[PDB]
Amino acid sequence: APTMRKKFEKVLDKKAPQFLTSLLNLYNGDDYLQKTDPMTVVTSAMVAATLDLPIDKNLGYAWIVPYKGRAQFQLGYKGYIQLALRTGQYKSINVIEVREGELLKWNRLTEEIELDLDNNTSEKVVGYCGYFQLINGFEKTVYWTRKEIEAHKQKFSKSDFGWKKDYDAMAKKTVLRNMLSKWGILSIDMQ
Amino acid sequence: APTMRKKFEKVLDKKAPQFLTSLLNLYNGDDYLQKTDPMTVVTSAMVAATLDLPIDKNLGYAWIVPYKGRAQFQLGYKGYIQLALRTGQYKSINVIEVREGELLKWNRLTEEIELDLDNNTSEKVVGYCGYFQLINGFEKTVYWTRKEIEAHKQKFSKSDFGWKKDYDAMAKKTVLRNMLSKWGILSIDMQ
Amino acid sequence: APTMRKKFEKVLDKKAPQFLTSLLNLYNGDDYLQKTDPMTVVTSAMVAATLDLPIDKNLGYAWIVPYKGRAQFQLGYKGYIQLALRTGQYKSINVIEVREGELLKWNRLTEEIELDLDNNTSEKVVGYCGYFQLINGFEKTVYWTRKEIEAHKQKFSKSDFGWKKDYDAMAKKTVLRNMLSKWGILSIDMQ
Amino acid sequence: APTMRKKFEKVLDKKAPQFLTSLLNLYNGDDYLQKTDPMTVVTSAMVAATLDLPIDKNLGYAWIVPYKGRAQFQLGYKGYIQLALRTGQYKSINVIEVREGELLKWNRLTEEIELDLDNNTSEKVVGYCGYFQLINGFEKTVYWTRKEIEAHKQKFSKSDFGWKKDYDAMAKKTVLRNMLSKWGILSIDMQ
Amino acid sequence: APTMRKKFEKVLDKKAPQFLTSLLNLYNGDDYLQKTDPMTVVTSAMVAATLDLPIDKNLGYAWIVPYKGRAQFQLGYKGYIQLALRTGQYKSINVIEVREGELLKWNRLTEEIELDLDNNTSEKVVGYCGYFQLINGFEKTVYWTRKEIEAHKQKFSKSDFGWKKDYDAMAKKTVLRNMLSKWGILSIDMQ
Amino acid sequence: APTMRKKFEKVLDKKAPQFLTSLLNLYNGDDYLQKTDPMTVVTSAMVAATLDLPIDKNLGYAWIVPYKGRAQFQLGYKGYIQLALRTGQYKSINVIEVREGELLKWNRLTEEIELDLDNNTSEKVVGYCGYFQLINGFEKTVYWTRKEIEAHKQKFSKSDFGWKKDYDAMAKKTVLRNMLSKWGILSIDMQ
Amino acid sequence: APTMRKKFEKVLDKKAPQFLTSLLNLYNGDDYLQKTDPMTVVTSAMVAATLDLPIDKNLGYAWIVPYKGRAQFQLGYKGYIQLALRTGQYKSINVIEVREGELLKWNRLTEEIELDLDNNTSEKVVGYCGYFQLINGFEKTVYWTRKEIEAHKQKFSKSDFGWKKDYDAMAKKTVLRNMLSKWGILSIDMQ
Amino acid sequence: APTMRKKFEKVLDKKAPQFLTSLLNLYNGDDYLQKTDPMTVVTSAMVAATLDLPIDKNLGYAWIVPYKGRAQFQLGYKGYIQLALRTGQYKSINVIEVREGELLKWNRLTEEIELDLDNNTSEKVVGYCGYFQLINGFEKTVYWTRKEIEAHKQKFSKSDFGWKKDYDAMAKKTVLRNMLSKWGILSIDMQ
Amino acid sequence: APTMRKKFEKVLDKKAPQFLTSLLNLYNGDDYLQKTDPMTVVTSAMVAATLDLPIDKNLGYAWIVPYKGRAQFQLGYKGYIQLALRTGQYKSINVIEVREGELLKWNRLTEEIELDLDNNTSEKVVGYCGYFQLINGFEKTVYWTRKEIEAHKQKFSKSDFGWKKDYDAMAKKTVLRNMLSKWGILSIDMQ
Amino acid sequence: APTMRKKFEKVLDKKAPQFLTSLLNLYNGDDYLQKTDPMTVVTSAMVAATLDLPIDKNLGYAWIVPYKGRAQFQLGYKGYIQLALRTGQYKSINVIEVREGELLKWNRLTEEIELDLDNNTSEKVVGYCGYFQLINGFEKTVYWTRKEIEAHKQKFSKSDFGWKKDYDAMAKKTVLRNMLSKWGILSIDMQ
DNA sequence: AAAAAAAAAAAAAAAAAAAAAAAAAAAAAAAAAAAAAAAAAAAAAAAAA
DNA sequence: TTTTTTTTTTTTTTTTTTTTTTTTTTTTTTTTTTTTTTTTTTTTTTTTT
């Protein structure tokens, strides 16, 4: 038992600046966590700083969100990218927007898609595509339409300010985060 | 005997942050493990952290479930994906939903299935299909119907909250986890 | 002599986490190995961890069973699958259940079997079939009836709890393990 | 001379785990090799591990048998199957039991045999048949009677425990091993 | 000159395990080669391992026999079978024993022989027959009597232990090896 | 010019083991080639290995004989058999000994010979006969007497050790080799 | 034009070993081609190897003879036999020597000759006869005397070493080659 | 149109070696075709190789002769013999020389000629005779005198070197070729 | 309808080389068919090659002559001979020239002609005679004079180059072709 | 019924080239059959080719003439000659022209006619005579005058181009065809 | 009854460099093998420009 | 620029046996180089029961 306590104390002392920065950023921010127990907020900042993911706004790697008076540590859509890059096994990641009259055919069985880029008749988007390929040959491609993204936003999202000014960025972020979370390979320790 | 103790101590010291993160996440969670022996919970967290599978909720790789006052470490449906990707011998993994009037014929002997996608008469699903192919030519395909999935859920599952709002996700997860567990090739050490 | 000792020590040090995981899982389990010599259990865990086959329950690759106060390391019905996949020469493996009024004829000399699937008059099973085919053209097919499986279970099996709730799974597992052990090609090192 | 020593050392270092597993299995077994020179046992384990044929009991590929105080490495009836499959030129191998009133005629010159299967008057066996066919058209068929098998067992076998409980398995194993050893084509390196 | 040296070195390095196995088997055997030059034994093992014919006792493909203080590599009666099967042009090979009152007539010009099998008056053998047929229509048949085999054994063989317990096996082996050596078609590289 | 050099180099690299085996067998043999230029011996071994005819003693397909200080590659009496079998157009080849009081008449114009076999008055040979028949109907028969064979041996052969112990084998070999060389159809590439 | 070049290159690559063997045999031979252009020798070896007729001495199918400083490819008296056998339409070919007091009468119009064989008064030859018969009924017979053969040898032959030791063989070869060249039917591709 | 092109291409590819041999023989020959268009020479070699009649000098079946700067393919006096033998309907062909005081009478109406052979008074020739007989009873006989042959040679032949050394061979060749061309039955495809 | 198309296609494919040879000979010839439709020329070559009558100049069996811009296939005076010989019912065919003072009398009713050959007073020809006799006894004889032949040549022939140098050959050819065409029996398929 | 269909199909397949030649000749000809049903033309060509009588113009054995929009197969004046010769019972056939002052008397009862040939006073024809005699003694003679032939031509013939340039040939053809058709003996199968 | 007829003459061919051998043969009979511990679940998501 | 949810297991233990035998032989080549020549000629008519 004392050995685990000493190891935990050493780990805690090794990562003081991240904890200090997270606490200072939380203090300097707005006042929306005043209805929750401070112990939960401290624990959330602790676990966030343990994973080398500060809570500073300029990076957007993690957040603290209160649920029923309890603070929860949450991962952003760039934390998955950070973990995937820390894994060190990826080769390519990309996500683009398919406009009107670009794709030719697409079947979900063989995951084969063909497009005719730089040949458009209008200036409105029709769908979005994402694709990531590893080093050992594994590849994955997904394609979403506007209706599915709208349904997902209506079902899950509970805000409308961000989705109004820039519709494309939120859709791209959702596609990227879903593709990376569901099928990606993640790791914690950098190699 | 002392050599094995030194090796075990070195292995323990090498993976402290995962153990710390798992313990902190368990502490910050709800109070449902208070009726079990803490030693079993500590051992379960230990073995979970040994396999590079943290117990944090944002990843969903493993769980701790108490059975008859004894805590047990359990693998999720993404842990199999993680192990398969760590193996480094796969080429493709996929699972889709076959809607009404899509498939033509299917026999379980030769595992040959043909479908006519993008040609539907209704908007209700009829079945689910899964398919994974390796690099050395080995392929595997499975097909489930709604009745079999309903029977499996009635026989094994003991909850109904998740199965109500989104029926398709649970069926896809069950098909994927069964196909990967029964016939897949798994490994622990990354290559 | 010293060179072999150094090589053995290096091999031992290379595979510490598997040994640690196996020992922890054995400790966390029930108390049924207390009537045997601990040295035999340690040796069995050692050889099990040497072959990249952990003893964790969630995988079911190997077991430790005591016989006359001596612990023995045993291979499950998925260890054969793992070794066959590690070989890298297979093309297809399958096992199905032949119901009432499905097969037409079957002779054990030429190993030729014909069936009329999706055309049944009842809902009771009559037999089981297994078939595996390699890449270089070698194929093997076996067919068992209910009477033979019942006789085998009565002769060899010494438990009845598992065979009661689900009769089909045990029969399929027995057919698969027998077909893979008697006629399959196995290997230890992954290619 | 130094070049051959370096090559031998490299070959030895390449196959350490098989040697370790064989030695551990020999140690964990019963005490029947204590009347022989340990150097011979070490050499036998060495040559057994050189051919990718471990000595573990669960596989039954090879054995170590002491003769006049000297240990000898011996091939089982599955080692021939393993070598034949490693050759990669086979198409079919089979062995069955001919019961009472099944075969019609059989001549040893043209190796032509005809049978009327699934038409029996009793439940006692009369003989055994074996047949293996290659890819380039070469085929071989053998047929043994009960008297010849009994004479062979009396002449060569020196134990009776195995032959009592299950008479058919030993006869089938003898037919298979004799047919594969005398007329089969074997190889060491996998292709 | 350097190119041939590099090619020879590559060929030597490609076939190390066979050489190692042959040397280990020679070392583990009895002490009868101590009166000969070790260089000749090494060269004989080298050429034996070059032709993919190990010197292990369990296979019986080749031997090393000392003549006037010089070791010589020799082919067994199964090496001819191995080479003939490696050729890939054969269709059938067989050898049987003709008992008393079985054959009717036999002339050595047209090589036509007729027999009445399964009709015997005694239980003593009278002669032996061998027959091999290729794919392109070429066939060859030979027939030996007891007197000729006895004369050959007296003239050439210099041992009597093997010929005493089992007279038929040695005669069959001699007929097979003579028929395959004198008239058969052999090859070294497998096709 | 470079293309022919590349083709020759590829052909040389394709047939290394035969060259290595021939050189090793020549080295392990007696010392009778020490009075000749090594370049001629190397060239002779090269051409011998090019035709898939190794120089090993156990086969007796080809020899190296020095003439006036120059080594020459020579074909044995089995090389003709090998080439004829490689041709793939033959149907039957045979050679027998005609004893006293067996043949009735023989004329060299129509090549018609009749004999009364199995009816002899003495045990001394009188002549030898050879006969080979193709598939397209072409047949050839030759008959030699003792006087002609003795004259040929006196005129051409320059040794007497072999001809003393076994007179019949040398006569049969001479008849076979002459009949196959003068009138047979030969080919190099196997079909 | 490129198509014919590709076809010629493929034909050249298909027959490399014959060209290599011919070149090696020419190199290993005596030095009598040093006064001619090497290009002509290379072309002659090329055309000789194109017709599946190697230039090796042990076969005697073709030769290279220099005329006025130009090498020429020439057919031997066995090349005609090889081509005739490749045709596949022959039934019988023969040539014999008619001794003193054997023939009775012979007219060149109807090509009818009668002889009384095995009835001689001396041991000196008087003439030679040749006869070949096809399958469709066509037959041809020729008869030469000693004077005509002597005149032909004096007129055409320019050497005397071969004609001295063995007079009969050269006469038989001349009769055979003339009869086969003037009236025979030849072909290049084997059927 | 494409079908005929494919058939022509297949026919061309089937007969490459004859074309290659003809071209190589033409290249290796003297320089007398340098004043003609190469396309005509290529076409002539093509048609010559199409009819299974190579242009090699050792056979003398066909020639290429330039006329007014245009190369022409020409048939020799042995090509007619080859075609007649390919027909498969002939029974006998012959041509002889009638010397002084041999024939008795000859009339051109009934084609009846009688001679008294082996009864001569001088050693000078007087005429030539040719005779060919089919299988169905058709026969043809021709007889030429010296004056007619001399007139034909003066009228048609434009060279004198060949006609000087050997007068009889040219006359026999002319008689044979005229008799076979004017009245013979020819065919292209062998039967 | 499809059956006749398949049969026609098979017949076309069976006779490709004749068509190819005819087309190549037509191409290599002079330019006199450039004023006609190529389809007619192709059809004429097709029908000419269908009847096993190539259009090569060295044989002179058939020709292509343009009439009013339309190519026509025409039979020569040797095609009738070829067809008559293919019939297989003829016994004798002949045509001679009757000189001055040879014939005695000739009447056209009974077709009886008598001549006194080898008794001439001048060296000028007076007429021509032709005679052909079958096997079943049918005979036919015709006799032409110089005036009738001159009248026929003036009426029908439209060229004078051939008729100038050799007057007898054209007259003999006309007599032969007229006698064979008007009264002969012809057939297409060889028997 | 199926047997007759198979026999008809075999007969059709046996005579393809004649049908092909007839169709090609009809196609290459002029356009005068375009007003008739193609089925009738095909049937007429079929029956014409069935009787071994091609429709090619160079032979003139048969024709196709349209009558009231229906094509009809017609026999020429040489088809009767062909059938009569196929019968094999004839001995002589002839037809001549009787000029002015040649015949003496002629009565139609006894069919006796006498003429004084080679004794004429003018150069104009007066009549025509025809005569054919069999082997068994049967003879037939007919005699026509100019008036009867003119009346027949006026009554039956409907063209005048042919009858103008050559009056004698048409009269001879009419006499021959009438005499052969009315009184001759005809057959279809050759004997 | 639809039948009259022709485009045909000819050559470039003689011949040889083949006789032959170094092969007789053996070290091989066979065994240690029968099979079991297996069924399954905890999962749906979002905070971003 | 905005804050959730859900549930807890089960079974069972082994046996069998050990070897043998024996070693070689044979020897050596030959011979010789070529030739000859180059074309021609000409194109449609007719009908229907």
Residue numbers in the entry:
A (entry chain N), B (entry chain M), C (entry chain L), D (entry chain K), E (entry chain J), F (entry chain I), ...: 34 to 224
Please share text taken word for word from the publication where this structure appeared:
Some bacteriophage encode a recombinase that catalyzes single-stranded DNA annealing (SSA). Redβ belongs to a large group of proteins annotated as the RecT family based on the protein from the rac prophage of E. coli. Here, we have used single-particle cryo-EM to determine a 3.4 Å structure of a homolog of λ-Redβ from the A118 prophage of Listeria innocua that we will refer to as LiRecT. The structure confirms that the RecT/Redβ family of annealing proteins share a common core fold with RAD52.
Standard single-particle analysis without helical symmetry averaging in cryoSPARC yielded a 3.4 Å reconstruction with fully interpretable density for the LiRecT subunits and the bound DNA at the central portion of the filament. The filament has an open corkscrew-like shape with an inner diameter of 20 Å, an outer diameter of 100 Å, and a pitch of 105 Å with approximately 10 subunits per turn. The two complementary 83-mer strands are bound as a highly extended and un-wound duplex to a deep, narrow, positively-charged groove that runs along the outer surface of the filament. One strand, which we call “inner” and color in yellow is bound to the deepest part of the groove with its nucleotide bases facing outwards. The other strand, which we call “outer” (orange) is bound to the outer portion of the groove with its bases facing inward to form normal Watson-Crick base pairs with the inner strand. Each monomer of LiRecT binds to 5 bp of DNA. Consequently, we chose to refine a model that consists of just the 10 subunits of protein and 48 bp of DNA at the central portion of the filament, for which the density is strongest. Although most of the contacts involve the sugar-phosphate backbone of each strand, the side chains of V98, Y100, and Q107 from the β1–β2 hairpin wedge into the base pairs at every 5th bp step to separate them. Overall, the duplex is about 1.5 times as extended as B-form DNA and is completely unwound.
